[PDB]
């Protein structure tokens, strides 16, 4: 765990979001990509419009944010960009559904999204268990997810970083648990059951957000939606981000070959031809159902589902040989 430098949180306190962005940030399809310098500022702005200017001690908030930035490794995908991207999707979700969730829930969930991948090394859960990494000995299921949480608390336990002090002793317990549950649900392993349970609950009518066990699951699916949201952007954004994920997947695949295990095709750079059909199946198996169920549960989330459908069709388009442009 590391600390931020002097003028990083001081310069951020001076940052203010330009006019055109104010109205664009509210949209689901919005893309933070073209604005790297403004990322930590976008997050502050997002926290202030969602739970207020006095939602956190500003000084702590910045120290915390910039320390979260430093604990994202320079990997091609599971990095600072991803963190802020997923947080923004949470903001859009919360704004479209504000009164459904509490002021504790919203600050918990924005923090969870920012922190959900902390200290990722570009290696999957599968990898870490197959090669008995200590993290797999320490964390027997949801290996990385449990580590990210641990990392969050550790960052909170730094000098002047604890943004959750002014709340309570019980409320401190509650929000951490919200954040713990939120991060754990970004393990895609858990996603499949969760979505299917939520789907059965909706189609029977039994779903009740006043039921704390039902609430957790809705929040879970919210986390998944945020996590996968690269697939809800405009086609060229979606395509670009795919490059980054494969750069990560293939480097892992490279490690397995060195230890004499032929990797899964998804992680095998010599199986590039299989990318479009692979993406298709992911859309069909994971993304579609996710945004579909999430739309039923939270009707104002429909644009996510809509954009996701556009990209499936784009990938279908690539398969038929109708691909255009194709810049890298």
Ligand X SMILES: c1cnc2cc(OCc3ccc4ccccc4n3)ccc2c1
Q: Does 278 bind ligand X (CB under 6 A)?
A: yes
The minimum distance between CB 228 and Ni ion, in angstroms, equals: 8
Q: Measuring CA to CA, how many Å separate 210 from each of 102, 202, 206, 292?
A: 12, 14, 11, 22
The minimum distance between CB 187 and Ni ion, in angstroms, equals: 7
**132 labelled binding-site residue:** no
78 is catalytic: yes
Among 245, 247, 288, 312, binds ligand X (CB under 6 A): 245
Q: In this structure, are residues 115 and 184 in contact, taking their beta carbons and an 8 Å threshold?
A: no
Question: If contact means CB under 5 to 8 A according to the sort of partner, which of ligand X, Ni ion, none does residue 282 touch?
Answer: ligand X
Report the residue number, 265 or 300, with the smaller CB distance to ligand X: 265
What secondary structure, in 3-state letters, does the chain show?
CCCCCHHHHHHHHCCCCCHHHHHHCCCCCCCCHHHHHHHHHHHHHHHHHHHCCCCCCHHHHHHHHHHHHHCCCCCCCCCHHHHHHHHHHHHHHHHCCHHHCCHHHHHHHHHHHHHCCCCCCCCCHHHHHHCCCHHHHHCCCCHHHHHHHHHHHHHHCCCCCCCCCCCCCHHHHHHHHHHHHHHHCCCHHHHHHHHHHHHHHHCCCCCCCCCHHHHHHHHHHHHHHHHCHHHHCCHHHHHHHHHHHHHHHHHHHHHHHHCCCCCCHHHCHHHHHHHHHHHHHHHHHHHHHHHHHHHHHCHHHHHHHHHHHHHHHHHHHHHCCCCCCCCC
Q: In this structure, are residues 312 and 284 in contact, taking their beta carbons and an 8 Å threshold?
A: yes
- Other residues' Cβ atoms within 10 Å of the Cβ of residue 55: 18
Instruction: Check 48, 78, 133, 214 and give the catalytic one.
Output: 78
Q: Which stretch binds Ni ion (CB under 5 A): 18-26, 190-198, 225-233, 309-317?
A: 225-233
Q: Does 289 bind ligand X (CB under 6 A)?
A: no
**279 labelled binding-site residue:** yes
Report the residue number, 75 or 155, with the smaller CB distance to ligand X: 75
Q: How many residues bind Ni ion (CB under 5 A)?
A: 3
Q: Does 186 bind Ni ion (CB under 5 A)?
A: yes
Report the residue number, 4 or 89, with the smaller CB distance to ligand X: 89
Q: Does 274 bind ligand X (CB under 6 A)?
A: yes
The minimum distance between CB 228 and ligand X, in angstroms, equals: 5
Q: Does 282 bind ligand X (CB under 6 A)?
A: yes
Q: Does 156 bind ligand X (CB under 6 A)?
A: no
Applying the rule CB under 6 A, the residues between 246 and 265 that interact with ligand X are 265
Q: Does 155 bind ligand X (CB under 6 A)?
A: no
Q: Does 214 bind ligand X (CB under 6 A)?
A: no
Q: Does 117 bind Ni ion (CB under 5 A)?
A: yes
Q: Which stretch binds ligand X (CB under 6 A): 24-32, 78-86, 92-100, 277-285?
A: 277-285
Q: Does 266 bind ligand X (CB under 6 A)?
A: yes
Residues 6+ apart with CB under 8 A from 141: 187, 189
The minimum distance between CB 186 and Ni ion, in angstroms, equals: 5
The minimum distance between CB 186 and ligand X, in angstroms, equals: 10
Binding site for ligand X (CB under 6 A): 228, 245, 265-266, 271, 274-275, 278-279, 282
- Annotated binding residues for a divalent metal cation, written as ranges, equal 82, 116-117, 227
Residues serving a catalytic function are 78
Binding residue numbers for 3',5'-cyclic GMP: 78, 279
């Amino acid at each position: 765990t590391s600390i931020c430098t002097s003028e990083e949180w001081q310069g951020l306190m001076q940052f203010t979001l330009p006019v055109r962005l104010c109205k664009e940030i509210e949209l689901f399809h919005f893309d933070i990509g073209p604005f790297e310098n403004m990322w930590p500022g976008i997050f502050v702005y997002m926290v202030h419009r969602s739970c207020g200017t006095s939602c956190f001690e500003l000084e702590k908030l910045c120290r915390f944010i910039m320390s979260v930035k430093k604990n994202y490794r320079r990997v091609p995908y599971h990095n600072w960009k991803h963190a802020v991207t997923v947080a923004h999707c949470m903001y859009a979700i919360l704004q479209n559904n504000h009164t459904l969730f509490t002021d504790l829930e919203r600050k918990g969930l924005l923090i969870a999204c920012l922190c959900h991948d902390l200290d990722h090394r570009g290696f999957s859960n599968s990898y870490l268990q197959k090669f008995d990494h200590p993290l797999a000995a320490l964390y027997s299921t949801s290996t990385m997810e449990q580590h990210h949480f641990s990392q969050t608390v550790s960052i909170l336990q730094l000098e002047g970083h604890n943004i959750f002090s002014t709340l309570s002793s019980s409320e401190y317990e509650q929000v951490l648990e919200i954040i713990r549950k939120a991060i754990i649900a970004t393990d895609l392993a858990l996603y499949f059951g969760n979505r299917k349970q939520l789907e059965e609950m909706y189609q029977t009518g039994s779903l009740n957000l006043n039921n704390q066990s039902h609430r957790d699951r809705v929040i879970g699916l919210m986390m998944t939606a945020c996590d996968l949201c690269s697939v809800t952007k405009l086609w060229p954004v979606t395509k670009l981000t795919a490059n980054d994920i494969y750069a990560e997947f293939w480097a892992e695949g490279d490690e397995m070959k060195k230890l004499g295990i032929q990797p899964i095709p998804m992680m095998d750079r010599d199986k590039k031809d299989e990318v479009p059909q692979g993406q298709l199946g992911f859309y069909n198996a994971v993304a579609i159902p996710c945004y579909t169920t999430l739309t039923q549960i939270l009707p104002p989330t429909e644009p996510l589902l809509k954009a996701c459908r556009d990209n499936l069709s784009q990938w279908e388009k690539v398969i038929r040989g109708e691909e255009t442009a194709t810049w890298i």
